[PDB]
Design an enzyme around this catalytic site. Structure first.
Site, PDB file in Angstrom:
ATOM      1  N   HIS C  43       0.799  -1.224   0.000  1.00 20.41           N
ATOM      2  CA  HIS C  43       0.000   0.000   0.000  1.00 20.41           C
ATOM      3  C   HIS C  43       0.835   1.279   0.000  1.00 20.41           C
ATOM      4  O   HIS C  43       0.310   2.375  -0.175  1.00 20.41           O
ATOM      5  CB  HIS C  43      -1.019   0.007   1.142  1.00 20.41           C
ATOM      6  N   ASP C  99      -0.541  -7.447   2.050  1.00 27.48           N
ATOM      7  CA  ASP C  99       0.043  -6.119   1.903  1.00 27.48           C
ATOM      8  C   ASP C  99       1.581  -6.281   1.934  1.00 27.48           C
ATOM      9  O   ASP C  99       2.208  -6.089   2.961  1.00 27.48           O
ATOM     10  CB  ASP C  99      -0.426  -5.267   3.078  1.00 27.48           C
ATOM     11  N   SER C 197       4.151   2.856   8.145  1.00 33.57           N
ATOM     12  CA  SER C 197       3.788   1.772   7.225  1.00 33.57           C
ATOM     13  C   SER C 197       4.988   1.234   6.483  1.00 33.57           C
ATOM     14  O   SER C 197       5.833   2.003   6.068  1.00 33.57           O
ATOM     15  CB  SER C 197       2.800   2.276   6.163  1.00 33.57           C
TER      16      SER C 197
HETATM   17  O1  LIG Z   1      -1.977   4.194   6.952  1.00 33.28           O
HETATM   18  C1  LIG Z   1      -1.954   2.959   6.971  1.00 33.28           C
HETATM   19  C2  LIG Z   1      -2.626   2.136   5.876  1.00 33.28           C
HETATM   20  N1  LIG Z   1      -4.094   2.184   5.944  1.00 33.28           N
HETATM   21  C3  LIG Z   1      -4.807   2.262   4.653  1.00 33.28           C
HETATM   22 CL1  LIG Z   1      -3.933   2.412   3.190  1.00 33.28          CL
HETATM   23  C4  LIG Z   1      -6.257   2.193   4.630  1.00 33.28           C
HETATM   24  N2  LIG Z   1      -6.933   2.125   5.795  1.00 33.28           N
HETATM   25  C5  LIG Z   1      -6.313   2.162   7.002  1.00 33.28           C
HETATM   26  N3  LIG Z   1      -7.049   2.175   8.193  1.00 33.28           N
HETATM   27  C6  LIG Z   1      -8.482   2.238   7.894  1.00 33.28           C
HETATM   28  C7  LIG Z   1      -9.093   0.866   7.919  1.00 33.28           C
HETATM   29  F1  LIG Z   1     -10.429   0.970   8.024  1.00 33.28           F
HETATM   30  F2  LIG Z   1      -8.619   0.190   9.000  1.00 33.28           F
HETATM   31  C8  LIG Z   1      -8.799   0.080   6.666  1.00 33.28           C
HETATM   32  C9  LIG Z   1      -7.954  -1.012   6.770  1.00 33.28           C
HETATM   33  C10 LIG Z   1      -7.714  -1.769   5.660  1.00 33.28           C
HETATM   34  C11 LIG Z   1      -8.363  -1.450   4.468  1.00 33.28           C
HETATM   35  C12 LIG Z   1      -9.194  -0.338   4.417  1.00 33.28           C
HETATM   36  N4  LIG Z   1      -9.383   0.406   5.502  1.00 33.28           N
HETATM   37  O2  LIG Z   1     -10.213   1.499   5.410  1.00 33.28           O
HETATM   38  C13 LIG Z   1      -4.776   2.116   7.115  1.00 33.28           C
HETATM   39  O3  LIG Z   1      -4.240   2.054   8.227  1.00 33.28           O
HETATM   40  N5  LIG Z   1      -1.366   2.206   7.934  1.00 33.28           N
HETATM   41  C14 LIG Z   1      -0.609   2.913   8.970  1.00 33.28           C
HETATM   42  C15 LIG Z   1      -0.870   2.417  10.391  1.00 33.28           C
HETATM   43  C16 LIG Z   1      -0.512   1.118  10.787  1.00 33.28           C
HETATM   44  C17 LIG Z   1      -0.792   0.687  12.105  1.00 33.28           C
HETATM   45  C18 LIG Z   1      -1.356   1.562  13.041  1.00 33.28           C
HETATM   46  C19 LIG Z   1      -1.709   2.851  12.649  1.00 33.28           C
HETATM   47  C20 LIG Z   1      -1.476   3.259  11.324  1.00 33.28           C
HETATM   48  F3  LIG Z   1      -1.906   4.439  10.848  1.00 33.28           F
END
Ligand SMILES: O=C(Cn1c(Cl)cnc(NCC(F)(F)c2cccc[n+]2[O-])c1=O)NCc1ccccc1F
Lengths: 11, 26, 250
Positions: C43, C99, C197
């Protein structure tokens, strides 16, 4: 706020 | 040679919190 | 990293910074697994919902770093990418299942006191170490709260029971993921956050004293929220794909 890196790498 | 850090394992020095990890592996 | 602390110099010599050329910015964390290969979260490179789709020429890999923003002259090494490989079944549409992505550098990096690869787990190590309650370590230059740090941050977190992981979110969790973090009543806290990430979740084997990367920081809902946990790509479950790519593409 990142410091300029050498252009040699940017190429 | 993977996973052995030059500034720690290879010199037999422990980092400040690795013990916490090892202590969790009951 | 939230509620973590400054890393010591040379503490995570496999930590890699994914750096965007223009604008110049930190994209994600990553890890060095050999002199020519880097492992990260898919991602970080491809995520259509946010129109994200980087190619080899859009990025730079910075290895051997400590300070987030400074160009550590004589210490870090900056590398260009030759080819990016994203898991064919990476599920960006639904839950970020699988991922994971591999990046082949143009030329081998030379190891040093600050640059050294982490080991990938074998079935036996994975079997004995990936247990609820056992702690792993996560590192990165990401946000400190849901200000960015001056230097690399580090936090040790316990692996959580699958049931608990499942019951904390609406998202469908697969066998290719595991979650980590403290329970709300556990007192201690900490978590990865934006910017972290792609980074490594590592564990130190008490059998041979080596560090192994068991997970890749993948996703979470917020950062260090009570009742929530961070999710990581289960590296061992995807090792055959990794082996396949590496021995097929060098
Ligand atoms: O930014 C990211 C990637 N990332 C992405 Cl692409 C999309 N959605 C995220 N959180 C939102 C969610 F609802 F949980 C989610 C998870 C998977 C797929 C879609 N969505 O909607 C997410 O997290 N990860 C960084 C991270 C890792 C661990 C703890 C906190 C943190 F921010």
């Amino acid at each position: 706020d990142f410091e300029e890196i050498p252009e040699e790498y940017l190429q | 040679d993977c996973g052995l850090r030059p500034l720690f394992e290879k010199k037999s020095l422990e980092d400040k919190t690795e013990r916490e990890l090892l202590e969790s592996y009951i | 990293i939230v509620e973590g602390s400054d890393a010591e110099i040379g503490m995570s010599p496999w930590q890699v910074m994914l750096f965007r050329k223009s604008p110049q910015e930190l994209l994600c964390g990553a890890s060095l697994i050999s002199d020519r290969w880097v492992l990260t979260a898919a991602h970080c490179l491809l995520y259509p919902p946010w129109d994200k789709n980087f190619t080899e020429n859009d990025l730079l890999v910075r290895i051997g770093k400590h300070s987030r923003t400074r160009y550590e002259r004589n210490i870090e090494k900056i590398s260009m990418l030759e080819k990016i490989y994203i898991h064919p079944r990476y599920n960006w549409r639904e839950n970020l299942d699988r991922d994971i992505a591999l990046m082949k550098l143009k030329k081998p990096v030379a190891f040093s006191d600050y640059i050294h690869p982490v080991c990938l787990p074998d079935r036996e190590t994975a079997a004995s170490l990936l247990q609820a309650g056992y702690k792993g370590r996560v590192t990165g230059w990401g946000n400190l709260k849901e200000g960015q740090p001056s230097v690399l941050q580090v936090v040790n977190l316990p692996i959580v029971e699958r049931p608990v992981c499942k019951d904390s979110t609406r998202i469908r969790i697969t066998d290719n993921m595991f979650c980590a973090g403290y329970k709300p009543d556990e007192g201690k806290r900490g978590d990865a956050c934006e910017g972290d990430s792609g980074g490594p979740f590592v564990m130190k084997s008490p059998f041979n004293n080596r560090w192994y990367q068991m997970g890749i920081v993948s996703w979470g809902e917020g950062c260090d929220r009570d009742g929530k946990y961070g999710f990581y790509t289960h590296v061992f479950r995807l090792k055959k794909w990794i082996q396949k790519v590496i021995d097929q593409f060098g």
